[PDB]
Amino acid sequence: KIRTSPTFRRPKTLRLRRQPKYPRKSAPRRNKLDHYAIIKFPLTTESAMKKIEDNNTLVFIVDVKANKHQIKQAVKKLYDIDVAKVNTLIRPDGEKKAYVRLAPDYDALDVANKIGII
Template sequence: MSRDPRDIIKRPVITERTTEMMASKRYVFEVDIRANKTSIKQAIEEIFKVKVANVNTLRVPGKPKRQGRHAGYTSEWKKAFVQLSEDSKELEFFESV
């Protein structure tokens, strides 16, 4: 089953903490919850044309939320921390900032 790499990598997670991590070529992405480390590595290398050294993943549980008397949970999602190799170029998410 060959999936498009853009189905595996949903979006970059850009916060203050992840912006500081970008200086050391470490990036954070929201990925498909069924994706494994190998498929995440292959997708990043194919989309951005870089060399990935390491991938760590984390499942983020859904939080309880309520709207009036209706209660529920937000969706669970998966986060991937991607470390690029020393000789690969950096990724540009926002050049104008």
């Protein structure tokens, strides 16, 4: 060995991994943003029933912590349907509205009767 550089450098020591003698918290926290917790209810509004009857969409009021991705897997799992796209807005009231456009092999107006909105 000769010092190639005129700088001394902190030599790269071995740093180990966490192998703890106990987990800090006893249980892994249960998911509280479920499929049921995320989707609260559908809007049965003049504006939102036309949105069903024209654009082949469903309109849901949704948990404000939700992605478009979480809404897509939620709308799928609860209503055995598949989603083309989800648009979301947070209302002035403060709750997140989801405009869940459905894939063209499913009628929105024939699944809106199945969930029970008219």
